[PDB]
Amino acid sequence: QCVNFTNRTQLPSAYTNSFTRGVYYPDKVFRSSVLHSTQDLFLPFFSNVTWFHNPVLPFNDGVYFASTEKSNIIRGWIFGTTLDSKTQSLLIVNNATNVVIKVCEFQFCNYPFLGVYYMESEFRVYSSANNCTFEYVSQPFLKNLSEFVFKNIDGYFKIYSKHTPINLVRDLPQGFSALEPLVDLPIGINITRFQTLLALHRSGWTAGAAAYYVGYLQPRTFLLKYNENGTITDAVDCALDPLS
Amino acid sequence: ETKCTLKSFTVEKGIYQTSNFRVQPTESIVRFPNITNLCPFGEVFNATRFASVYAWNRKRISNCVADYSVLYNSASFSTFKCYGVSPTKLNDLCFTNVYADSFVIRGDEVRQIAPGQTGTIADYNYKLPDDFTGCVIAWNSNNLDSKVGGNYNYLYRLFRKSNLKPFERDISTEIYQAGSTPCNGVKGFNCYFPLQSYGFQPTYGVGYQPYRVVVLSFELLHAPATVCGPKKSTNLVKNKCVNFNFNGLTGTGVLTESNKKFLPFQQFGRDIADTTDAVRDPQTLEILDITPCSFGGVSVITPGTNTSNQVAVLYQGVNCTEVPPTWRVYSTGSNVFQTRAGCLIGAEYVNNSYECDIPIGAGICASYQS
Amino acid sequence: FQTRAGCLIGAEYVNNSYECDIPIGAGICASYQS
Amino acid sequence: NGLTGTGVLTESNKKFLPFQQFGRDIADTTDAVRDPQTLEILDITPCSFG
Amino acid sequence: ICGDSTECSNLLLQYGSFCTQLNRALTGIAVEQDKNTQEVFAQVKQIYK
Amino acid sequence: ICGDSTECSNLLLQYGSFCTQLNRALTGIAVEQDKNTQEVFAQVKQIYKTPPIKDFGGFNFSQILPDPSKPSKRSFIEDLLFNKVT
Amino acid sequence: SSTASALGKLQDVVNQNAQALNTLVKQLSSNFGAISSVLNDILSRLDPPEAEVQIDRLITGRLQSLQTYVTQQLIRAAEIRASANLAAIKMSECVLGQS
Amino acid sequence: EAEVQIDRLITGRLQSLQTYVTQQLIRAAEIRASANLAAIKMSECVLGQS
Amino acid sequence: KFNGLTVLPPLLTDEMIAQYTSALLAGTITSGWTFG
Numbered sequence A: 001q002c003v004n005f006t007n008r009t010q011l012p013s014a015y016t017n018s019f020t021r022g023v024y025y026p027d028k029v030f031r032s033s034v035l036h037s038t039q040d041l042f043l044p045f046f047s048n049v050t051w052f053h054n055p056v057l058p059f060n061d062g063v064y065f066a067s068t069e070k071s072n073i074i075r076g077w078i079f080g081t082t083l084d085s086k087t088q089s090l091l092i093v094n095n096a097t098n099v100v101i102k103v104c105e106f107q108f109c110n111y112p113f114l115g116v117y118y119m120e121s122e123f124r125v126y127s128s129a130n131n132c133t134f135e136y137v138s139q140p141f142l143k144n145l146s147e148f149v150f151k152n153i154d155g156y157f158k159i160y161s162k163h164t165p166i167n168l169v170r171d172l173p174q175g176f177s178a179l180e181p182l183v184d185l186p187i188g189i190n191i192t193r194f195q196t197l198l199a200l201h202r203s204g205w206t207a208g209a210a211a212y213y214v215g216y217l218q219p220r221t222f223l224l225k226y227n228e229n230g231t232i233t234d235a236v237d238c239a240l241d242p243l244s
Numbered sequence B: 001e002t003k004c005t006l007k008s009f010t011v012e013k014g015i016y017q018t019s020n021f022r023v024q025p026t027e028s029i030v031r032f033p034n035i036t037n038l039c040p041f042g043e044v045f046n047a048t049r050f051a052s053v054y055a056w057n058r059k060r061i062s063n064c065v066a067d068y069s070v071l072y073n074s075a076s077f078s079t080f081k082c083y084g085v086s087p088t089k090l091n092d093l094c095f096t097n098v099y100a101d102s103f104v105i106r107g108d109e110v111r112q113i114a115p116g117q118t119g120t121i122a123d124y125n126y127k128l129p130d131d132f133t134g135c136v137i138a139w140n141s142n143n144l145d146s147k148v149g150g151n152y153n154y155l156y157r158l159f160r161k162s163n164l165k166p167f168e169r170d171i172s173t174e175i176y177q178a179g180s181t182p183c184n185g186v187k188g189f190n191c192y193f194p195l196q197s198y199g200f201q202p203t204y205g206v207g208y209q210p211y212r213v214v215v216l217s218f219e220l221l222h223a224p225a226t227v228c229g230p231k232k233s234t235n236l237v238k239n240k241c242v243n244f245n246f247n248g249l250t251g252t253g254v255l256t257e258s259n260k261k262f263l264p265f266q267q268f269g270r271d272i273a274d275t276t277d278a279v280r281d282p283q284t285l286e287i288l289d290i291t292p293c294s295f296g297g298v299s300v301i302t303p304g305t306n307t308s309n310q311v312a313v314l315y316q317g318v319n320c321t322e323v324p325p326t327w328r329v330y331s332t333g334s335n336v337f338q339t340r341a342g343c344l345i346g347a348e349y350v351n352n353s354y355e356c357d358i359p360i361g362a363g364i365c366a367s368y369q370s
Numbered sequence C: 001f002q003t004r005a006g007c008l009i010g011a012e013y014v015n016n017s018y019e020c021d022i023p024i025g026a027g028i029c030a031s032y033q034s
Numbered sequence D: 001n002g003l004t005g006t007g008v009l010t011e012s013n014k015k016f017l018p019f020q021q022f023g024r025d026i027a028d029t030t031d032a033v034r035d036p037q038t039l040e041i042l043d044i045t046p047c048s049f050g
Numbered sequence E: 001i002c003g004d005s006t007e008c009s010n011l012l013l014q015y016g017s018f019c020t021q022l023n024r025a026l027t028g029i030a031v032e033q034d035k036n037t038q039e040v041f042a043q044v045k046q047i048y049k
Numbered sequence F: 001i002c003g004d005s006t007e008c009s010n011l012l013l014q015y016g017s018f019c020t021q022l023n024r025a026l027t028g029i030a031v032e033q034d035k036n037t038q039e040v041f042a043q044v045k046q047i048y049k050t051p052p053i054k055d056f057g058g059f060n061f062s063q064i065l066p067d068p069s070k071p072s073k074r075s076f077i078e079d080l081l082f083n084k085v086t
Numbered sequence G: 001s002s003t004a005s006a007l008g009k010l011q012d013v014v015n016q017n018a019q020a021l022n023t024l025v026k027q028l029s030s031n032f033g034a035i036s037s038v039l040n041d042i043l044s045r046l047d048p049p050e051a052e053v054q055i056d057r058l059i060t061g062r063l064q065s066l067q068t069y070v071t072q073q074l075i076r077a078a079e080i081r082a083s084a085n086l087a088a089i090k091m092s093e094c095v096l097g098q099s
Numbered sequence H: 001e002a003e004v005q006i007d008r009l010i011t012g013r014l015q016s017l018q019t020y021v022t023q024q025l026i027r028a029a030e031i032r033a034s035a036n037l038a039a040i041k042m043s044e045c046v047l048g049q050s
Numbered sequence I: 001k002f003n004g005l006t007v008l009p010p011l012l013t014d015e016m017i018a019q020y021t022s023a024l025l026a027g028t029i030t031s032g033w034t035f036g
């Protein structure tokens, strides 16, 4: 139950500085007051970050997704290669209740969205879901800056997350905040592209304040500092400058 | 002891280092998670239908307790070959992410299933990594996977552009440009279909019949353990040098109520060079810290065997509160003293001060009058 | 700047002469005023 | 001709007797190779590092 | 000990950090040489003529 | 090199007596250090004391002589030296 | 009192000794070609006829590391002894008389 | 099986390198002693009568 | 520079060594020992 549109929305993709965001805890080992050097896939410092005000974007190795979100307009995520019934696809939705994660051979049309009724009762993202392999339910994920990191390594889909109170207008904050791991999924797909999902106010769609920041990951070596409480407070990117 | 360690029947006045002492542990403890449910192995082995080598079937197993004794003691398996572990030790290891890859092969290629091997299926259908850890199971299936008229549902690929990366499956059934002549979707000449079936008939002798083969692949200490063997947990005791086995992690030391705080997702902690300082117990989910029970070096002070035979014993850097080499003779009632160097037994401290003969350390030194 | 020790980038060569702070080699060394 | 190595190849004026195939100087390090086809004497220098 | 070979480097990687301390010792003696010469000769504060 | 294991010790004992000389060298080093300090400092036979009244023609040694007030019984410069270096 | 870094030699000695101990300790974490850098695991994972091989590899690696450490210590001790001998001469000559 | 031969070559070359480094250390110590003597001689005999 | 060897130049050039020797010698000819 999905139809096309006439208002061909075109998001004005601008560019911004990455600053020093996108650092997460790499392992499950506690460490206190120590400088540890580790090599892994990270977001390099001071890189370009694309700003979108829903194009199909390539996944590459992994994705850093940020949103200075208000009222939580963003709902879900789509992952796959062709986003059709010919290949396995991953879907994530986060409504006012527990999240839903599915890995199935969906049938995605041109404009997938949730839809809200005014008491919400609407779900018309796709058209068919024949073969399903994995399902998952847990706590809901979501003025405020929400950061997520998606990785796909060794048949494991890692999703890390963090929430921060922010008050700056547009630019990404100049500060440091580690990312605690959120969930690991033991499912193997060959994802190469992804999308985003919006809950447009269906009563004519009115979803224009849909801004999100996208950045990509590269493999490199970092130096991390753990304080006495085991919290990462500082990091140094090795391959950035002679000083580094 | 000093005579024996110095290889002489006489010893001169001085101080000699003989050996070290350690506190022996007792009451070994095994602590495993509470998750207990039979792990589904039979249906993998007793499956009616298997898959061709180019489409080998994979199953992921986790959150179960596994009994490998039924597999090991059964003689139905012609080849039971384990590489990184011993078959008899499999009932005492905890680990995650069990992988079971099942298929059926030609009888003569069974020894191509090994790390660092070259063959037809070894490089075009299924290649194992060099550092593979796990086991392989091979057993004949003449009575089932062979037909008198000849079954041909079992396929294998002979032509490919290049080799295969370890743990990779290819199901691309496309014509291959065998020669310089292009195919353009038509076989013609110098082009052949990569896949062909097997001529399995009961008429063939040994080494020709189909063999059902399944490989089990493991991981070693890279996650919170999810699969464990048939072992019984016990209670924990603190403040005593004991042997402990936490979820396959073996060690020896004393356990204490730790003060450090863990975020809700770690499992343990370390400081420098694989020194596991803290551990979370799998059942009670209570943090503890581990420190090895006391040890030290022992030295003797003797005035020379030509003069007398009395000796004094110094335990270096050890608190005198606990001391009892057995040598219970110097543990009953002999005079004891505590100095910054350690604990001294057999010598008495005197307020008189004058130059000494046998230095001890930290300004303390001893001599023969007793 | 090209010198006997090697190729030096990021620092400018001058015609003065002071004491030696951070030795470089072949008779030359560098310092902070750039 | 089976002798493998990495370097930069220049022209050389050294003279080989008609039966050698490659030269060396000391500590057993190759320095000059006669190419099989044009029968000329080349010179090998390790490309720069530091 | 490797001569620009990837597998040789990988195999050497698991031998620890012998090379770090080797280079450290060589650098130490190299610095000591210059310190030695400067100590021997630089005995004056000016340059008389 | 064994970490309190019997099998490691059994395999090690067939390597000969390396550890005897390994310990011997370190013991020699320690004894040498003690001798070094003893011969550098113990140049005198007695322990002299300064007189209670100090009139050294105008020279002022208060910064160098030990301070009885401090429990450490060390002078000012010695305290500075001890504090500066770890 | 004010200017620091005036005691470079003593600090250098302390740093050298501490760094030597640190690298000696850190050497315990290398595989040296075996399957694991922890000995209890390989004892508790496979049958002795090859545990002996793995322990052989660990033993030879750790022996080499220990020998290197001892030799470095010997060289440094000789140098320090020379310095202390010079200091003794200086105290004997300049403190106890006019030079 | 190529890894075994590679390992043998690696250990041999590493041992040779260690031997060279140790020899260098000994020689440097000797030279340092000689240069200390030279500095003392230059200070005591050139800058004054001994 | 063959297969990893590198020779580093000394910090003091031979000209500077000559200058120190000349300074010492010209000082000791004229001043005596007082310049030390």
Ligand SMILES: *[C@@H]1O[C@H](CO)[C@@H](O[C@@H]2O[C@H](CO)[C@@H](O)[C@H](O)[C@H]2NC(C)=O)[C@H](O)[C@H]1NC(C)=O
Pocket (backbone or CB within 6 Å): A130, A131
């Ligand atoms: C789920 O996947 C199976 C396995 O591919 C699908 O079954 C195949 O469907 C195609 C479609 O024409 C057939 O050509 C194949 O013969 C079928 N079997 C196999 C083994 O591939 C199935 O259609 C998918 N969907 C559902 C709802 O089951």
Ligand SMILES: *[C@@H]1O[C@H](CO)[C@@H](O[C@@H]2O[C@H](CO)[C@@H](O)[C@H](O)[C@H]2NC(C)=O)[C@H](O)[C@H]1NC(C)=O
Pocket (backbone or CB within 6 Å): A227, A228, A229
């Ligand atoms: C590390 O954890 C400790 C333990 O809570 C923190 O100490 C508390 O800090 C707050 C904020 O200053 C104080 O109100 C509490 O009184 C402190 N606790 C105690 C027991 O004094 C500490 O702030 C954390 N961070 C750092 C950097 O130490």
Ligand SMILES: *[C@@H]1O[C@H](CO)[C@@H](O[C@@H]2O[C@H](CO)[C@@H](O)[C@H](O)[C@H]2NC(C)=O)[C@H](O)[C@H]1NC(C)=O
Pocket (backbone or CB within 6 Å): B041, B042, B045, B046, B070
């Ligand atoms: C596959 O099924 C057979 C029979 O269904 C299992 O055979 C068992 O063999 C053991 C040892 O001889 C007996 O104690 C059991 O009683 C047998 N099972 C039954 C149901 O009688 C065989 O073990 C199964 N395969 C696996 C891998 O479990």
Ligand SMILES: *[C@@H]1O[C@H](CO)[C@@H](O[C@@H]2O[C@H](CO)[C@@H](O)[C@H](O)[C@H]2NC(C)=O)[C@H](O)[C@H]1NC(C)=O
Pocket (backbone or CB within 6 Å): B319, B320, B321
């Ligand atoms: C050996 O252990 C005893 C028992 O803990 C120590 O005695 C305590 O020492 C602390 C100071 O280190 C005092 O505050 C306590 O009052 C002492 N008595 C107790 C705790 O009952 C003793 O100091 C230890 N020996 C050494 C050399 O540290």
Ligand SMILES: *[C@@H]1O[C@H](CO)[C@@H](O[C@@H]2O[C@H](CO)[C@@H](O)[C@H](O)[C@H]2NC(C)=O)[C@H](O)[C@H]1NC(C)=O
Pocket (backbone or CB within 6 Å): D037, D038, D039
């Ligand atoms: C090997 O190299 C080429 C291969 O064809 C040939 O060399 C040329 O031969 C033509 C024919 O006489 C000459 O005109 C050229 O001058 C040759 N070139 C060179 C570089 O010698 C020939 O077959 C062989 N040449 C030699 C020297 O063995």
Ligand SMILES: *[C@@H]1O[C@H](CO)[C@@H](O[C@@H]2O[C@H](CO)[C@@H](O)[C@H](O)[C@H]2NC(C)=O)[C@H](O)[C@H]1NC(C)=O
Pocket (backbone or CB within 6 Å): F060, F061, F062, F063
């Ligand atoms: C030697 O010098 C010290 C350092 O100044 C003198 O100690 C000071 O004495 C004056 C007057 O008694 C006090 O006001 C200062 O507070 C003292 N300074 C310190 C750091 O104690 C000392 O008096 C001098 N010796 C003599 C004999 O006068």
Ligand SMILES: *[C@@H]1O[C@H](CO)[C@@H](O)[C@H](O)[C@H]1NC(C)=O
Pocket (backbone or CB within 6 Å): A007, A008, A009, A010, A205, A206, A207, A208
């Ligand atoms: C049409 O799309 C633009 C681009 O997002 C949006 O700003 C505008 O509100 C939309 N108008 C309507 C009527 O939907």
Ligand SMILES: *[C@@H]1O[C@H](CO)[C@@H](O)[C@H](O)[C@H]1NC(C)=O
Pocket (backbone or CB within 6 Å): A015, A048
């Ligand atoms: C990357 O950042 C630079 C620097 O601002 C900018 O000029 C460029 O347009 C950005 N995007 C790409 C694709 O280079």
Ligand SMILES: *[C@@H]1O[C@H](CO)[C@@H](O)[C@H](O)[C@H]1NC(C)=O
Pocket (backbone or CB within 6 Å): A093, A094, A095, A096, A097, A098, A099, A100
């Ligand atoms: C939406 O909320 C309802 C409320 O129970 C429930 O179906 C689930 O939590 C959510 N559904 C999906 C598809 O996310």
Ligand SMILES: *[C@@H]1O[C@H](CO)[C@@H](O)[C@H](O)[C@H]1NC(C)=O
Pocket (backbone or CB within 6 Å): A143, A144, A163, A164, A165
């Ligand atoms: C922002 O997030 C914090 C915690 O993540 C939450 O308490 C707060 O209500 C959020 N603010 C809004 C406007 O949703």
Ligand SMILES: *[C@@H]1O[C@H](CO)[C@@H](O)[C@H](O)[C@H]1NC(C)=O
Pocket (backbone or CB within 6 Å): B033, B034, B035, B283
């Ligand atoms: C095992 O049993 C104890 C006591 O009944 C219980 O507290 C614990 O939660 C159980 N284990 C798990 C994983 O729930």
Ligand SMILES: *[C@@H]1O[C@H](CO)[C@@H](O)[C@H](O)[C@H]1NC(C)=O
Pocket (backbone or CB within 6 Å): B306, B307
């Ligand atoms: C023991 O000492 C006595 C007295 O000095 C001496 O006469 C005797 O020879 C010594 N014996 C030995 C074995 O040293």
Ligand SMILES: *[C@@H]1O[C@H](CO)[C@@H](O)[C@H](O)[C@H]1NC(C)=O
Pocket (backbone or CB within 6 Å): B349, B350, B351
């Ligand atoms: C000196 O002897 C007295 C005996 O009354 C004793 O109490 C005291 O501890 C002694 N002093 C020392 C330093 O042992």
Ligand SMILES: *[C@@H]1O[C@H](CO)[C@@H](O)[C@H](O)[C@H]1NC(C)=O
Pocket (backbone or CB within 6 Å): C013, C014, C015
């Ligand atoms: C330094 O002086 C030389 C000659 O006096 C001249 O060639 C050169 O350009 C000068 N360089 C600078 C930076 O002044």
